[PDB]
Amino acid sequence: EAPAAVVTGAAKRIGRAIAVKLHQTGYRVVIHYHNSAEAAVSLADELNKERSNTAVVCQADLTNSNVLPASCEEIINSCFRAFGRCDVLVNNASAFYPTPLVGKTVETQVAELIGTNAIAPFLLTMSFAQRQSNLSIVNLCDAMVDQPCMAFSLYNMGKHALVGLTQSAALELAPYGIRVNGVAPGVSLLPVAMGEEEKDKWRRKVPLGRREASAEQIADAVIFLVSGSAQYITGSIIKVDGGLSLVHA
Amino acid sequence: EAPAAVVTGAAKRIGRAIAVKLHQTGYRVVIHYHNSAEAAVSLADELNKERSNTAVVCQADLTNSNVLPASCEEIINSCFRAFGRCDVLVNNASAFYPTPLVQKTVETQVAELIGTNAIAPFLLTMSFAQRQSNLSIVNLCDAMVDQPCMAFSLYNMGKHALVGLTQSAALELAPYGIRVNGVAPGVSLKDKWRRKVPLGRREASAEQIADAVIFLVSGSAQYITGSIIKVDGGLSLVHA
Amino acid sequence: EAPAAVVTGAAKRIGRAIAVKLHQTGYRVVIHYHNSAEAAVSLADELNKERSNTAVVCQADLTNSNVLPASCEEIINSCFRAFGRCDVLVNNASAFYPTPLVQGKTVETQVAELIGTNAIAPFLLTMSFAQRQSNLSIVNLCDAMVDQPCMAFSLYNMGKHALVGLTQSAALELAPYGIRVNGVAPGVSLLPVAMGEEEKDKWRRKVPLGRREASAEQIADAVIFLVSGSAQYITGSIIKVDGGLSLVHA
Amino acid sequence: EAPAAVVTGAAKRIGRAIAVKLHQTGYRVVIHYHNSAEAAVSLADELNKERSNTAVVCQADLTNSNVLPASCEEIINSCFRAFGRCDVLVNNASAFYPTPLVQGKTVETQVAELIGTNAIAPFLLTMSFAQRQSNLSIVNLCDAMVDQPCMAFSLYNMGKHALVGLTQSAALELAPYGIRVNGVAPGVSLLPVAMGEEEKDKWRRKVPLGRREASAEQIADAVIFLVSGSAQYITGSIIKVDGGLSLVHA
Ligand SMILES: NC(=O)c1ccc[n+]([C@@H]2O[C@H](COP(=O)([O-])OP(=O)(O)OC[C@H]3O[C@@H](n4cnc5c(N)ncnc54)[C@H](OP(=O)(O)O)[C@@H]3O)[C@@H](O)[C@H]2O)c1
Ligand SMILES: NC(=O)c1ccc[n+]([C@@H]2O[C@H](COP(=O)([O-])OP(=O)(O)OC[C@H]3O[C@@H](n4cnc5c(N)ncnc54)[C@H](OP(=O)(O)O)[C@@H]3O)[C@@H](O)[C@H]2O)c1
Ligand SMILES: NC(=O)c1ccc[n+]([C@@H]2O[C@H](COP(=O)([O-])OP(=O)(O)OC[C@H]3O[C@@H](n4cnc5c(N)ncnc54)[C@H](OP(=O)(O)O)[C@@H]3O)[C@@H](O)[C@H]2O)c1
Ligand SMILES: Nc1nnc(-c2ccc3nn[nH]c3c2)s1
Ligand SMILES: Nc1nnc(-c2ccc3nn[nH]c3c2)s1
Ligand SMILES: Nc1nnc(-c2ccc3nn[nH]c3c2)s1
């Protein structure tokens, strides 16, 4: 009776806030993770303490390879095994690091940045759709996709590809009652590795409050798109960026 | 106590559905009208029956003229007079009709399709901002702005200007805590069109439009500014 | 036999560069101006010395009013009166100044100038150009920064957005008549005359490609391309000529 | 000293027209091909007949694999070995076929081909071109219909969106080296040879400007503009050459 959702990269940060908020809304959740096993299991525990049998973890590397399609099939399969249905897919997992044009090989960087950000979402969408009410998919896009960070070409290419996926899947899956939309953060939870001075630099550019989005503010937008209040919305990407993308150089 | 909202063109169709849903969310509402007095009063009567003195009407012609600034000032003033505050402005009033390039005087068409659709929103935004917690403005945009209807140049120009207003005002009013966003309908703005809509199994409704407005004004959108949410069932994604 | 073009606001700066380059390409030109009469006649003189009877001036206020349609009709009529044809229209004239939302022109004067020159006059000129009708085209001078606007420039930004709308709508509607409609969108080109060098340099340093503004000739080069036979399948396109400026985040 | 250009997928159709036009403009050219050896060689021979020693061919599969980076480096290197320089890179090669989301080549083969040719190979060639480095520029062949995609072409559409991102990212990053990066976005150009005329006509009828597809030469014309001295302030721009097709509602 309770709908179920898959959230990729849900152990920490934005994915975690999305998983929590979906769960609070009445969803049973698959918490996908890659490396963060301790945090993933700890979240599922917390959620199950609240309503028993409403959260499972599922481990998978979302780097592109010849076995990525089986890994994505497995993620969707894990939701059906635990819950007997899969109503919502949130493509939240992402690799993010510079790849300048001028210790990983370039084909590894391609496999990670294009695999996680675009190919895995595509295969997960395929598996989600094939395995099939208010069905929908939400992709975590990037509000700054047309004003990209310097030396982030592969990342930016993957995020552009994800816009294409959002539009193409919205068109193709509409006759099956599956809506596909995006949420596009500007600056939200900044990278762990980033110094406080660089963090503050980005914070000062944001027109609305000179602060980053909380993870919860991003999840709020995801909640809207999966809700019955968004039933005529497909192929839309909602910026949740405090106006950052509007600010000229 | 309760927040207050101005909705332009609120007597019928989309503006009515927006006024109703804001009222249901707990807003006091100014129902603006130009020609539809009976409809505006009927809505106000319906809302006041639910909760006393929570709905007023306000007449103004939104055509561009030397008196448009005064009229827009009055609309915002009427909210402050009735309710002591003005938290939300919904720029919903719209004129819609073709203006072929190869052939009402043209300058009258300009006054309506640019005046009502873009200049009135600009003047209302100025007045709203001047007279100033979760403050926001929502502009009713058009999902088909980049694939426009044939021979609707002035209309299309006004809706493009309204996008520009949404972004410019989002930037300039952010320091004041005023968020500025848009909702862009499709076919809600006949059977031939519905069959082209990807989510065509669902009928388009004014309430679906209002649902997106309600989100953008809510605390669930407090970091969202300068965004335009398409509510078009995927229509804008469909090639010719 | 030579084709003819109207350039609005052509007395100086980018409009002059466009009129000159069209003239060098073999066009006869209507140099429209509003206040810059000396500069306009002087440019017509230069072009007419190069080839006689190839340039005329035409004075018009492009502020919106109930007579703006007549003024726009007259500009197009001037081209047919001088040259017997009108092949190209370049909507280059523009008012540009701030209009803050929170507070000695009246607001309705600001609307009439910023929306009139930037959008309504281009619409009326387009109407008159089309109705008076080979390689026919219209080029609108747009703004590469239309989605990352200057703070407190709402009316200017609304006008330039409206011009993108006109470009697309007119391309759609006029295509059956063989009239192409395209746009050229500068980022920073010739900085305002009233701007001091220090402020100019702040803008210059933002530009990835060479940390300098576009020359007027660089803008004109893109106009020349769009009116040329090398752009015969291009309509409804807006070419940024911005040195990468619009790609730079805050 | 004549400048040099690499054109990928240059044996036929659009890439061929681009190679021809660049050669006519005075470029020496590397004609890259995958399967079309006879056509590539016939083009090189025709070009060398016009001016000896101005065209070479270079075979490479541009499908993504662990050897793709080496292949792309070899394509750029072949330009330097043949001509001593490489001024222009045109990323034209493309795979195009449907990949339905709901139910041959395996899906990972489809990924390697559609994403490899359309996006990753352009990225690797851009890296190699830049690492090797006056009017240097790259032109990527994009798709004017990228936001109104064909039904069931998700991977193709993803690859073309990725290419827009590459165009913008590389424009920003390479601007300090004086390398401009732009795109040309056809709508309907040369249709498949086997596609029935009745099917070709369904697409032709949708084009506002002339109810016809672009010739390969019309696409090449925009490429020539972008690499020319007339575009030296243009970077990060994508020119639609689509006859207004992308402006047409459903
Ligand atoms: N934060 C921002 O400011 C911002 C801005 C724009 C867009 N976004 C987008 O919003 C989403 C969430 O942002 P975020 O900052 O929360 O993301 P994040 O913490 O950088 O990454 C989210 C998760 O992705 C997973 N991941 C990384 N590489 C992976 C791989 N090869 N296979 C499988 N999973 C992998 C990680 O899982 P494990 O920890 O389990 O290994 C990680 O916890 C992302 O899609 C991001 O691109 C965020
Ligand atoms: N320069 C830049 O950096 C830049 C950046 C983005 C976009 N653009 C666009 O490119 C185009 C040319 O730029 P620019 O700097 O050369 O323009 P500009 O010098 O600011 O203005 C060009 C001409 O517009 C005419 N004009 C102004 N108000 C008018 C009115 N009410 N009626 C009739 N004509 C009027 C003036 O003619 P008179 O002198 O005869 O009175 C003026 O010479 C404009 O459309 C502009 O918006 C320029
Ligand atoms: N034609 C149109 O209407 C249209 C519309 C939108 C966009 N475009 C874009 O414009 C560009 C040119 O269009 P087109 O129709 O002329 O292209 P096309 O003929 O479909 O393909 C161009 C060449 O790409 C090469 N190619 C394909 N797969 C390859 C692989 N795995 N490795 C290496 N090379 C490969 C082929 O080379 P070989 O023959 O040597 O094997 C082919 O001749 C393309 O990027 C296309 O996407 C075209
Ligand atoms: N401007 C930005 N600074 N950090 C960003 C960021 C941080 C974490 C991310 N995870 N995925 N993508 C991310 C972008 S975007
Ligand atoms: N960023 C910019 N700095 N100056 C700009 C400018 C200069 C002259 C203009 N005339 N019309 N519009 C203009 C914008 S845009
Ligand atoms: N609408 C379109 N019809 N055919 C198209 C087409 C034809 C050949 C291509 N090669 N790459 N991409 C292509 C698109 S696009």
The resolution in Å comes to 1.7
- Other C-beta atoms closer than 10 Å to the C-beta of D97 total 12
For chain A, the C-alpha Rg in angstroms (whole number) is 17
Cα(C61)–Cα(C71) distance, rounded to whole angstroms? Answer: 8
Any chains having at least 3 CB pairs less than 8 A from chain B are A, C, D
Contacts of B145 (CB under 8 A, 6+ apart): B156, B159, B160, B163, B184, C165
Q: Give ∠ CA D164-D166-D170 in degrees, rounded to 5.
A: 125
Distance CA C84, CA B134 (A): 61
DSSP tag of B57: E
Nearest one of A141, A133, A148, A130 to A164, comparing CA atoms: A141
Q: How do beta strands A28-33 and C180-186 pair?
A: unpaired
Contact C150 A205 (CB under 8 A): no
Question: In chain A, positions 167-196, which contact chain C (CB-CB < 8 Å)?
Answer: none
Could you give the CA distance from residue B93 to residue C26 in angstroms, rounded to a whole number?
49
Which whole-number Å values give the CA distances from B111 to B40, B108, B121, B158, D139, in the listed order? 23, 5, 13, 10, 44
Instruction: Give Dmax (Cα) for chain D.
Output: 55
Does domain A1-249 fall into CATH 3.40.50.720?
A: yes
Sheet hosting strand B55-59, strand order edge to edge:
B55-59, B28-33, B4-7, B88-91, B136-140, B179-185, B228-231
- For an interface test with C, the pick among D180, D237, D240, D241 (most C C-beta atoms closer than 10 Å) comes out as D237
Residue with tokens 């505050």: B85
Distance from C-alpha of C162 to C-alpha of B157, rounded to nearest angstrom: 4
Bridge partners of residue D179, in order along the sequence:
D136
Place of tokens 């930004």: C157
Return d(Cα A129, Cα A126) in angstroms, integer.
5
- Say how far apart CA B24 and CA B21 lie, in whole Å: 5
Residue B230, judged by CB atoms within 10 A of its CB (0-12, 13-18, 19+), counts as: buried
The owner of tokens 């396109």 is C237
What residues contact residue C168 under an 8 Å CB cut-off, 6+ apart?
B146, B148, B156, C236, D247
CA distance A137 to chain B (A): 14
Rounded distance, CA A155 to CA A189, Å? 17
Cβ separation C239–D237 shorter than 8 A: yes
| Inter-chain residue contact D165 with A157, CB threshold 8 Å | yes
Backbone angle region of D83, left / alpha / beta, with phi > 0 → left and psi within -120 to 50 → alpha:
alpha
CATH 3.40.50.300 fits D1-250, yes or no: no
| Contact in structure between A97 and A150 (CB atoms under 8 Å) | no
User: What's CA A202's distance to the chain center, in Å?
Assistant: 22
Q: Out of C27, C33, C156, C242, pick the active-site residue.
A: C156
After which residues, if any, is chain A broken (C to N > 2.5 Å)? 102, 132
Selection from B143, B132, B136, B145 nearest residue B170 by Cα:
B136
Q: Name the strands in the sheet holding D4-7, side by side, starting at the edge strand that comes first in the sequence.
A: D55-59, D28-33, D4-7, D88-91, D136-141, D179-186, D238-241
Alpha-carbon gap: C146 to the closest alpha carbon of chain A (Å): 10
DSSP state of B234: T
What order do you get walking across the sheet with C180-186 strand by strand?
C55-59, C28-33, C4-7, C88-91, C137-141, C180-186, C238-241
**What's the first-to-final CA gap in chain D, in angstroms?**
51
Structure tokens at A64: 């592109």
Looking at chain B, which residue has its C-alpha nearest residue A227? Answer: B211
Tokens standing for residue A52: 């028993």
Does A3 sit in the ligand 1 pocket, CB within 6 Å? no
- Which residues, at least 6 apart from C132, have a Cβ–Cβ distance to it below 8 Å? C76, C77, C80, C86
Atom of ligand 3 nearest to the CA of D60: 33
Q: In angstroms, how far is CA A205 from the centroid of its own chain?
A: 24
Q: Which of B220, B225, B230 faces A220 most closely, judged by CB atoms?
A: B220
Collapsing DSSP to helix, strand or coil, A202 comes out as helix
D149 and A187 Cβ atoms separated by less than 8 Å: no
- Tally of CA atoms within 13 A in the half-sphere of B104 that contains its CB: 13
Note whether C154 contacts A: Cβ–Cβ < 8 A.
no
> What are A120's two structure tokens?
């895995």
Q: How far is the CA of C122 from the centre of ligand 1 (A)?
A: 47
Q: Check if D86 has its Cβ closer than 6 Å to any atom of ligand 3.
A: no
Specify the residue for token string 């106009």.
C223
Closest ligand 6 atom, residue B239 Cα: 1
Check if the beta carbon of residue C36 is closer than 8 Å to that of residue C7.
no
H-helix or E-strand spanning residue A244: none
The alpha carbon of C12 and the centre of ligand 6 are apart by a number of angstroms equal to 44
Inter-residue contact C145 to C187 (CB < 8 Å): yes
Secondary structure E strands in chain A: 4-7, 28-33, 55-59, 88-91, 135-140, 178-185, 237-240
**B142 flagged as catalytic:** yes
Contact B168, B114 (CB under 8 A): no
CA A210 to centroid of chain Cα atoms: 24
Cβ distance B101 to C161 less than 8 Å, yes or no, reads: no
Q: Count Cα neighbours of D147 within 13 Å in the Cβ-side half-sphere.
A: 15
- D163, D127 in Cβ contact below 8 A? no
Q: Minimal CA–CA distance to B123: which of C97, C119, C111?
A: C111
Tokens for D104, please give them: 């041959």
**CA–CA dist C173, B154 (Å, integer):** 12
Residues in chain C: 250
Ligand nearest to the CA of D58: 3
Contact D94 CB / ligand 6 (< 6 Å) = yes
**B72 contacts B120 by C-beta, under 8 angstroms:** yes
The CA distance from A191 to A7, in Å, is 20
C-beta neighbour count of D35 within 10 angstroms: 10
Measured between alpha carbons, how far is A164 from A144 in angstroms, rounded to an integer?
Answer: 15
Q: What is the identity of the amino acid at A4?
A: A
| CA dihedral for D210, D212, D213, D217, sign (positive or negative) | negative
Distance, in Å, from the CA atom of D147 to the CA atom of A168, rounded to the nearest integer, reads: 9
Q: Amino acid identity of A21?
A: K
SS3 B146: coil
Which has the closest alpha carbon to D119: D57, D177, D161?
D161
Distance CA B222, CA D240 (A): 37
Q: What secondary structure, in 3-state letters, does chain C show?
A: CCCEEEECCCCCHHHHHHHHHHHHCCCEEEEEECCCHHHHHHHHHHHHHHCCCCEEEEECCCCCCCCHHHHHHHHHHHHHHHHCCCCEEEECCCCCCCCCCCCCCCHHHHHHHHHHHHHHHHHHHHHHHHHCCCCCEEEEECCCCCCCCCCCCHHHHHHHHHHHHHHHHHHHHHHHHCCEEEEEEECCCCCCCCCCHHHHHHHHCCCCCCCCCCCHHHHHHHHHHHHCHHHCCCCCCEEEECCCHHHCCC
- Choose among B71, B25, B68, B19: nearest CA to B46: B19
Do residues D127 and B217 make contact, with C-beta atoms less than 8 angstroms apart? no
- Interface contact flag, A164 D162, Cβ < 8 Å: yes
Contacts of D110 (CB under 8 A, 6+ apart): D97, D99, D155
Phi, psi of B183 (to 5 degrees): -125, 130
- Residue B63 has phi, psi (to 5 degrees) of -50, 135
Nearest residue by C-alpha to atom 4 in ligand 5: C191
Q: Which residues, in sequence order, are CB contacts of D5 under 8 Å at separation 6+?
A: D19, D22, D27, D28, D29, D30, D79, D86, D87, D88, D89, D90, D227
And the tokens for D28? 């020496």
Spatial distance between the Cα atoms of C126 and C121, rounded to a whole number of angstroms: 8
Beta strand ranges found along B114-196 (DSSP E): 136-140, 179-185
Structure tokens, B184? 């862009």
Those residues with Cβ within 8 angstroms of residue A15's Cβ, 6 or more apart along the chain or in another chain = A7, A8, A9, A32, A90, A92, A93
The β-bridge relationship of strands C88-91 and C137-141 is parallel
CA of C94 from ligand 2 middle (Å) equals 4
Q: In sequence order, which residues have a C-beta less than 8 Å from that of residue C67 and are 6 or more positions away?
A: none
**Exposed, middle or buried by CB within 10 Å (0-12, 13-18, 19+), for B25?**
middle
- What residues are paired with B59 via a beta bridge? B33
**Cβ–Cβ under 8 Å, residues C218 and C18:** no
Question: From atom 2 of ligand 4, which residue's Cα is the shortest distance away?
Answer: A187
- Scanning the structure block, which residue is given the tokens 């405090």? A242
* Experimental technique behind these coordinates: X-ray
Which candidate, C86, A207, C235, D4, places its Cα nearest to that of B168?
A207
Order the strands of the A28-33 sheet from edge to edge: A55-59, A28-33, A4-7, A88-91, A135-140, A178-185, A237-240
Q: Is B13 on the interface with C (CB under 8 A)?
A: no
User: Which DSSP string do the residues of B76-101 spell out, in sequence order?
Assistant: HHHHHHHHS---EEEE---------S
Distance CA D76, CA D85 (A): 9
Structure tokens at A84: 């007997």
Q: Is B192 annotated as a binding residue?
A: no
- Nearest-CA neighbor of B12 among B38, B48, B30? B38
Interchain CB distance below 8 Å, D154 and A161: no
CA distance C171 to A76: 46
Tokens for B15, please give them. Answer: 């503006």
Query: Catalytic one among A155, A220, A232, A241?
Result: A155
Q: Which residues line ligand 5 (CB under 6 A)?
A: C 94, 96, 150, 188, 191-192, 203
Rounded to whole angstroms, how far apart are CA atoms D94 and A172? 22
In terms of Cβ atoms closer than 10 Å to its own Cβ (0-12, 13-18, 19+), residue D140 is buried
CA distances from A85 to A56, A88, C37, C91 (A): 14, 9, 75, 58
Q: Please confirm, yes or no, whether B176 is among the known catalytic residues.
A: no
Structure tokens at B116: 């009502």
SS3 track for A111-142: HHHHHHHHHHHHHHHHHHHHCCCCEEEEEECC
C124 neighbors C72 (Cβ within 8 angstroms): yes
What is the Cα–Cα distance from D203 to D189, expressed in whole angstroms? Answer: 10
What is the CATH number that goes with domain B1-240?
3.40.50.720
Non-local CB neighbours of B110 within 8 Å, separated by 6+ positions: B64, B154, C64, C120
D36 annotated to a ligand binding site: yes
D146 CB near ligand 6 (under 6 Å): no
The answer to whether B24 contacts chain A (CB < 8 Å) is no
* Element spanning D180, H or E: strand D179-186
Question: Which residue ranges make up each domain of chain B?
Answer: 1-240
Q: Which amino acid is at B209?
A: I
Contact status of D25 with chain B (Cβ, < 8 Å): no
Cα separation of B143 and B185, whole Å? 5
Tell me which DSSP letter residue D191 carries: -
- Residue type for A245, please? S
Nearest CA in chain C to D166: C247
* Residues of chain D neighbouring C208 (CB-CB closer than 8 A): 171-172, 175-176, 235
Which residue's CA is minimally distant from atom 34 of ligand 3? D34
Q: Find residue C239's DSSP bridge partners.
A: C184
